[PDB]
Amino acid sequence: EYEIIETIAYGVVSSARRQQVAIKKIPNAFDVVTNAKRTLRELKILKHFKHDNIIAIKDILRPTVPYGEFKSVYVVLDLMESDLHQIIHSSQPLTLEHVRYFLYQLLRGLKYMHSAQVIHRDLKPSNLLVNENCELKIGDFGMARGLCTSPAEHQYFMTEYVATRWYRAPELMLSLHEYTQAIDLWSVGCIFGEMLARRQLFPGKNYVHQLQLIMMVLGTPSPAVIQAVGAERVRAYIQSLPPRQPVPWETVYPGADRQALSLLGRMLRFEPSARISAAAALRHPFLAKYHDPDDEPDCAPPFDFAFDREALTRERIKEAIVAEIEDFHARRE
Numbered sequence: 001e002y003e004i005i006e007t008i009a010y011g012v013v014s015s016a017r018r019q020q021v022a023i024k025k026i027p028n029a030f031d032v033v034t035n036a037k038r039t040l041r042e043l044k045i046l047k048h049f050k051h052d053n054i055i056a057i058k059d060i061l062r063p064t065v066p067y068g069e070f071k072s073v074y075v076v077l078d079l080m081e082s083d084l085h086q087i088i089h090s091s092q093p094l095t096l097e098h099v100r101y102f103l104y105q106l107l108r109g110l111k112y113m114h115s116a117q118v119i120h121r122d123l124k125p126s127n128l129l130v131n132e133n134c135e136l137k138i139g140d141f142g143m144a145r146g147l148c149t150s151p152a153e154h155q156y157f158m159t160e161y162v163a164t165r166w167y168r169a170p171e172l173m174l175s176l177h178e179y180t181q182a183i184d185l186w187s188v189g190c191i192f193g194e195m196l197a198r199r200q201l202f203p204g205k206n207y208v209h210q211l212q213l214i215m216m217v218l219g220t221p222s223p224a225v226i227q228a229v230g231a232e233r234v235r236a237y238i239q240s241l242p243p244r245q246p247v248p249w250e251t252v253y254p255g256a257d258r259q260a261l262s263l264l265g266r267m268l269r270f271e272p273s274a275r276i277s278a279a280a281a282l283r284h285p286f287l288a289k290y291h292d293p294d295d296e297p298d299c300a301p302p303f304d305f306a307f308d309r310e311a312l313t314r315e316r317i318k319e320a321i322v323a324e325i326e327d328f329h330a331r332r333e
């Protein structure tokens with residue numbers, strides 16, 4: 001039993017006294033197909049992972065009412081005091097060591113997540129929650145996908161609408177037909193840069209301005225990347241602009257830490273294949289202070305998204321979610 005305090009952005013998330021905990025209500029959870037599918041994914045992802053840098057479900061409330069009348073899902077989580085957006089963009093400290101440590105934990109979480117063939121696809125400071133003990137936890141897995149996706153999804157083709165514009169990888173923006181865990185490392189690059197300057201790296205107002213801002217720092221993309229652009233009109237737009245060499249990161253962040261900018265430069269690249277992985281980034285000298293491979297596990301077995309590729313009705317998705325809630329309780333008790 002619980003007692004509610006105040007409404008906390010993250011849907012209907014309420015602060016509740018029991019020690020304090022977070023309770024998230026998913027109202028009318030089975031009314032819309034896309035929403036219901038998303039809840040099923042999130043439940044399955046968060047039950048799969050067991051990692052101190054990934055948000056964990058602490059409890060799920062079972063239906064008090066009969067099955068038909070079961071309309072809303074209540075999920076209980078550990079109360080986090082803040083998120084990385086609020087920390088960065090406020091009056092509290094954010095030294096280089098804060099940056100170093102927050103980056104370390106994010107990458108630690110991603111190594112584990114990525115080894116299970118799960119791409120978050122929506123990493124940004126507001127999805128990185130921080131408790132009062134400074135533990136960073138990755139949340140909001142609604143956008144996450146595997147390496148394989150069904151054509152039935154609109155996002156399969158319309159990749160430039162995936163997730164948040166300010167943190168969206170070039171492969172998604174330009175539809176480069178290479179969608180790997182590297183998607184997340186671009187986003188990490190953006191978060192890392194944002195931590196160093198305390199302002200967003202690429203705050204684009206629209207599709208074209210977003211590409212402008214990326215090019216103003218990274219320069220014009222290579223012919224291989226340009227030809228890999230699916231849309232002729234985007235391809236033509238890029239070819240119309242004059243040539244531009246990459247701006248060194250030393251200039252973009254004057255007086256910043258050398259090893260930090262070294263690591264940043266290995267994240268923010270146009271080509272997904274060129275980017276450092278989460279695992280390899282943990283071995284970078286910038287994170288040597290915290291790095292310990294024995295305390296940085298992979299996830300086994302891999303996560304399978306097959307359940308999400310099925311064309312299920314609302315009622316069939318409700319059934320799957322209820323089976324996950326039953327299973328949550330059945331494993332422990």
Ligand SMILES: COc1ccc2c(C3CCN(C(=O)c4ccc(OC(F)(F)F)cc4N)CC3)ncnc2c1
Pocket residue numbers: 008010013022024026038039040042043046055073075077078079080081082083129138139140141
């Ligand atoms: C700053 O105050 C806050 C804000 C958000 C908190 C939060 C949110 C952090 C992100 N998050 C989730 O990742 C999430 C978890 C479960 C979920 O249920 C489903 F699996 F059935 F779909 C849906 C979600 N979207 C919402 C909960 N948790 C804990 N404490 C918080 C303190």
